[PDB]
Ligand binder design. Structure first.
Ligand SMILES: Cc1cc2c(cc1C)N(C[C@H](O)[C@H](O)[C@H](O)COP(=O)(O)OP(=O)(O)OC[C@H]1O[C@@H](n3cnc4c(N)ncnc43)[C@H](O)[C@@H]1O)c1[nH]c(=O)[nH]c(=O)c1N2
Ligand SMILES: Cc1cc2c(cc1C)N(C[C@H](O)[C@H](O)[C@H](O)COP(=O)(O)OP(=O)(O)OC[C@H]1O[C@@H](n3cnc4c(N)ncnc43)[C@H](O)[C@@H]1O)c1[nH]c(=O)[nH]c(=O)c1N2
Ligand SMILES: O=[N+]([O-])c1ccc(O)cc1
Lengths: 481, 481, 480, 482
């Protein structure tokens, strides 16, 4: 059947070597600093067993077996919308897209290998013909069958951006041995989200100038592999769910993976050795994460606009003309992200393997627009709230004999329900005035590369030209051709 | 048959009373200050007779008569996209959207009356039953049959914004008599575009607090109607078509219409007397204009991004990383305008008479997003050009035996064709650095109300509430009942 | 003699009734939620006894008494710069302007009273001649003498912004009884910073339409007055100073003060009963908090520009031309705050009592320019750091026998010193990505009214006219 | 005496070879396309003869000669503020800062040479001891004695930015001969303002990477030098001064200068040969024009904010709270430009020659701040006007028997004076909605390099390191060593 939450939490007790800040984690599923976000993954798995959600969360495969939608391939626009409906439902069900790396997101990128596996094999260098397209498809089919969480770690160490000669010194993961059975790898995958909570690490790399072949590695290994150490930032999870209804639900840890002479059988190596292959194929893997981030950006905008409507209605600024036009900014932002999501689905194309991909240019520029504006939109939500965004009663101040009477009168705006301003306050404060929400803004700003990086890669990949179909209108107006 | 350019130029010599700055106009079709823009309408009609454009420019109605697509009703998504393609082709064929009130735009707004003529009659006050749904339909059918340009004049005078007392001292058009033949109107329709080049004036009004019943008028009268005087700003048309390839094509005049005891028969009056009717119904008339705005916004953004690509290629800054990401901004802006347009088409609804209308929130917030960003985008196009946007050879300077070799070397960038930099500069200069191009920015900024107006009206119209479907997600996250 | 830190910590244990979140505080000086910030006030008082800082931190008065510069009155430009240099050195000494309401700032507004004390009396209504302009000056000179911290609480409750009538039902502090000994006040001062840490509450009011006379209260009372309750948000202080070098130094708490039938003698009442007097004179009180806010804006801008320089150097991006222009924005922002501070001092004027005041237009518009750009400037600093703002070693990770070699190598940029990037990361994280740093952003944004508030109040007070010497040039160019 | 306006008009008819668009110019003083801007320079010269302005416009030198304040050297802050009050007065009397390259601006850069001439000589390469510091000083004394306008042409051809190696094929002015009498130069000074209206061309370069040594020429030659052609864009002057009260006052033409084997004597050669000299010293030359640009930015911000007050008052939006905070934006900008100007004066330093210079970081970052915000400030003024910015009566429409009554009622806002709204519109239209207005914006945006250039150059020249003053506080807070 489809994996359950209990099966997930049980499988975390597997020997994995995990730091979270200054601490060592006995069992990710039960430790104070990690159990809350482990239960969030459990909840994710449990949503696929909820009968009111079976139509949206699951599908019948051609074999007759019911599967999680996170394994659903899409070959047309209607199939894309069904996938987007699944991703959207998962992030709405889970604290308003507050947990952006649920397994559905992690595993989405695997579909690029399924679509066209051969080039990974044929462009390899130094595998002595042991890498097999069939084994790539086999690993992914294995992930599907067991509902395994493959956490992607691709990005380089942030060592020294001064040098193009930097990558000779790199502590980045390299191949130190190749034999009949597989490769041995040594060094760091410098950054990943949620790896302490995953089953398998999806290893990969982006091209950088001068990248040696022994650091071009796409492969998979279990989180509990001997030689693997997960090294995570301190947990930001909060002990009081009444004061912090979002931040008490757990912290989606980020951190690095140390590999000490780790063995990886050829059956789980997708490609090694070719810098050129690392140019466009890695971008094709992360495309699916870029499209997904549009779904998130839309739910996030919708939340921020919503919270603006609620708080201005409750303090009674909502009918002040100058505030109406500020709330219109946050609402316009949401409609903009909605427009880009729907436009990307309309203007899509079929890949080599005949999968339907949404419009690259629309979702990538949609992400750039989100990152350009997001912090201004949070400034606006906080600014519209005035003091109610931070200076509200603790629940015990509120319910105290002496203080209750004063609290209730100070929060007596036009839509009654005085305690409700404390509820809106709590969510605004968790989402954007705590360590826990600040991490989410950093994740959002960096996970798919930041604003200048999005723009640079999109232009390098598009190869826009004066003589290209881009310029036809300009050329005609100037009388060139 | 479909009206020809020749027929239209003939029809302009009808004794209409026109000021264009300090001059009176004997014949708008031949006067130096108007003939170039009169020929631009002539070109508009003539497009409908190009054999290679007949599928795009025309359709076959239920009688078997061929008609210009400006009279085409859209009853579903596919018919809308077919209407948008027509509009897109019209503005691409006419100086890349430099003439935004061609007759297709002007007459689009009449489809609201056709869709649901009855409320215009039934809600009329003081007409003594004289106004009939049938005659509203009969006028619009008469406009169709003769391909008439009905220029909309709705907006008030801009006299005193400080108080609502403003509508009693207003020279705004008022009914001074009602008899059994029709109405006599006296006063001003303060602002119109292209009236001097129209066949009929489409009179309307928007609600404002305390608007008297006698100023609520929706009617139609010929431009040459006795007592109608058309008073236009000075003409910005340029004399040298080589130096000003766009500004020499003609100036789409704006200005005001004086009515002195003008008689309109009941046959040509659509509604009078009801301020409440003027709240929602006029907005419904201009929805079609706001949608069309989105189409122009896309084509304008595509021309701006194309000029950025062209000029940065020509001066050889296109591969400079820091410039590449500035050009990403302008391309990003175009993709945002493409997303809103397609998304509005995708997320539309059926009106009372079963016409398909695009999503009001998406097209209205698309216009907001364009007005908020437009000046920044012009500034980046001009800033990326350097001196080449303004300081370039006149054609006699370029071709002088002595100066030619110096200009050739000065404009010999990485893609050669040195004179092509003058071709691009001329277009940038005309669009963004002449009185002629400034007028178009000002039109674009005000015609559909400015940014703070779009935001206000859109919010007032949408009755957004925290209880409504909008605040659903935020309420769930906040734990509000 | 100038008060010591020890003396100040001792005096906090005076029975003051304080909530911090869900907890009651028996002693503000020693409770884990409050002791660190309390010690920051104790540090403040001790900076005045340092013989190496004496020439900046203290002055000799007419009597020959060494007094703290927080009590120094400036009558010319030179003297205003000496006061400012004091405020600057205080904010550099205390974790880069991270504690914006040290006593020097709190007590600065009292100089408006010292300058023109009469009106406060002469415009009072229903006091029966009990309020003396003599007794306001006596209080402030008593505070001076005993280096007393007087915390300003003027702002209204945020109840209902739809209704203008909603100043009658409001729990705003009102005068319920006026007798011969003094007044009795009941209700709420809805918002204050650091009141739990202060000696006295400075009770004021700003004017809103239809403010009733019984709600127009300018007064002072001790923080431990019977019937006073201090109610503060939960404390955001961090446990581990290694991981959180700024957030572990303590949380400058914000809260409300509840007054339950609180008696205030006439000697400690400044003004009552006149909505008219509450238009101009309360703004003139907070003008000094406003000027000071520009000194902080400059130092905060300087701090942010210096972290941008430190972090872009350490990761090796500082020479990438496109990063260079982004660091340029943060450096220019600093220079913009510097320019406004120095311009405001140059174009100052004398008040009625002969005090030198910096230009109101410049320091107030300087504040608007800060609020407008600040969140975009934080965005640039964080964006410029990349992962290094947040994803970095904990200290036990750094030091581990297995991880040290990896961390040393991953952090080895052009200016070597690999652990230095963790130090920069810890400060960017604390300043801008914690509970603690966010409150400083919220405080900056609201304490002096938000941007749309600064703009409208500045316009309404300036009363800018087409016919006044603003559009002088515009009239001339127009032929009007 | 100080040179008069009329004397200036006579000096223009000196055989200079001048294109303005497709037309050759016989006399810049009198030609329809140039005569108005020629009269604005004549007005400049006549301001120094107005007895009501004698104190502001002129000084007495060490020999008792009364001289135009454009030649006044400032050795402290009081002197700098006297020079700034002079520049401010000139731009206020001349169409509210609408003519940014009056002779006072052009001639201001020459003070860098006067301050410290030796390095122009000592750093010269391949001159064989012919370039003399005393002669740079003698040229500037001669300029001062004849009140001559030296127009500065420094910037390169905008040919190909793709590779520095492309400067191989660049038609930028090069030395094509050095002999005992002087040099011969051939090619283009690609860009300059008001050269058609100047007496002498001030020639220079800025370092770009790969600039060829043979293009490193700092010199001066007359505008009518044989082998010089001035080639200007088309004139944007307007016919009807009632309808265009600013753009009818004339067009400060921009363009390029062609040198065909032009002879410059060693006496008028300041420096040749050394790209390394061209890194710092040319920026010191243009510093004075970056300071001046801040004075213009304050007067221009003052004008915009004023126009915003005047128009919102007239249509009656000025008490609408939402409009009130938008006008605060325009006023805050003016305040910001003021703040930068006054801070830069307060925080100035003495140069090697003893001249007082205002603070470089503050005037240049104030310039950056203006280029970043200017486009948005003009949008705000135009957006605040509504239609009053463009759609208003022409004067004959206003005065018509039939339309007057409608126009008077349509313009009858809370401050009466109906025709004043047309007057405000005319100014708003001319500044921001004509070709003449667009050229000023384009001038302000590029003349002192654009935003990304200002920022890039200020960072390269100040070299702000983590171990310098700018990292002192952050190091302390982070506990990093110094
Ligand atoms: C919270 C979180 C979570 C994750 C990740 C990051 C973070 C912060 N990442 C890695 C993420 O993609 C990465 O941080 C970004 O790509 C940015 O890279 P750097 O941190 O190295 O900044 P980097 O040093 O590249 O950037 C520094 C700053 O300088 C600018 N800059 C740098 N080089 C420039 C240039 N040449 N021109 C112009 N500007 C330049 C950048 O734009 C940026 O503003 C990741 N990765 C992964 O594979 N799987 C994962 O799950 C995650 N998860
Ligand atoms: C951290 C902290 C610390 C302090 C304080 C606040 C905070 C948050 N304050 C109080 C502070 O001055 C107050 O929060 C601000 O004046 C903003 O007021 P409100 O919070 O009531 O917002 P309010 O409800 O007034 O405003 C909320 C939002 O709506 C907008 N808005 C409201 N009315 C509007 C209108 N009519 N037109 C247009 N826009 C409008 C505002 O611009 C803002 O964006 C304070 N006070 C004090 O006296 N001493 C102190 O020490 C402190 N300390
Ligand atoms: O480093 N990179 O090139 C990246 C990293 C992440 C991403 O989503 C795209 C590209």
């Amino acid at each position: 059947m489809i994996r359950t939450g209990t099966q997930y939490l049980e499988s975390l007790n597997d020997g994995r070597n995990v730091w979270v800040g200054n601490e060592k984690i006995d069992n990710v599923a039960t430790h104070p600093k990690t159990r809350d976000y482990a239960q969030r993954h459990a909840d994710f798995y449990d949503l696929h067993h909820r009968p009111d959600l079976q139509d949206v969360m699951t599908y019948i495969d051609e074999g007759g077996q019911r599967r999680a939608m996170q394994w659903f391939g899409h070959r047309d626009k209607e199939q894309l919308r069904r996938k987007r409906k699944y991703h959207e439902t998962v992030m709405r069900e889970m604290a308003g897209a507050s947990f952006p790396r649920t397994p559905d997101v992690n595993n989405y990128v695997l579909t690029t290998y399924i679509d066209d596996p051969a080039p990974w094999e044929t462009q390899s260098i130094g595998d002595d013909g042991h890498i097999k397209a069939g084994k790539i498809v086999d690993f992914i089919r294995y992930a599907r069958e067991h509902d395994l969480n493959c956490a992607p770690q691709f990005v380089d160490p942030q060592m020294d951006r001064s040098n193009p000669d930097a990558q000779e010194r790199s502590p980045g993961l390299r191949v130190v041995e190749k034999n009949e059975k597989g490769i041995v790898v040594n060094g760091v995958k410098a950054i990943g989200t949620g790896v302490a909570f995953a089953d398998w690490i999806h290893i990969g790399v982006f091209f950088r100038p001068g990248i040696p072949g022994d650091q071009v590695i796409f492969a998979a290994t279990p989180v509990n592999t001997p030689g693997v150490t997960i090294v995570c930032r301190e947990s930001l999870v909060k002990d009081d769910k009444v004061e912090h209804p979002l931040a008490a639900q757990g912290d989606e840890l980020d951190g690095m993976t140390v590999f000490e002479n780790v063995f990886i059988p050829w059956s789980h190596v997708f490609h090694i050795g070719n810098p050129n292959h690392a140019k466009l194929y890695p971008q094709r893997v992360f495309d699916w994460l870029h499209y997904h981030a549009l779904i998130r950006q839309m739910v996030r905008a919708e939340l921020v606009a919503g919270l603006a409507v609620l708080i201005t209605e409750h303090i009674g600024t909502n009918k002040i003309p100058a505030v109406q036009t500020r709330v219109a900014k946050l609402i316009g932002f949401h409609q903009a992200m909605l427009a880009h999501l729907i436009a990307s689905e309309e203007l899509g194309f079929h890949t080599p393997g005949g999968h339907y991909k949404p419009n690259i240019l629309i979702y990538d520029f949609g992400r750039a627009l989100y990152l350009e504006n997001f912090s201004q939109m949070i400034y606006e939500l906080v600014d519209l709230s005035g003091r109610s965004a931070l200076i509200f009663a603790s629940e015990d101040q509120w319910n105290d004999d002496k203080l209750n009477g004063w609290f209730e009168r100070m929060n007596n705006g036009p839509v009654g329900r005085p305690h409700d301003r404390v509820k809106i306050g709590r969510v605004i404060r968790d989402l954007f005035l705590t360590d826990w929400g600040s991490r989410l803004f950093v994740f959002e700003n960096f996970n798919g590369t930041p604003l200048q990086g999005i723009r640079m890669l999109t232009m390098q990949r598009a190869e826009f030209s004066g003589s290209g179909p881009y310029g036809k209108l300009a050329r005609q107006v100037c009388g060139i051709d």
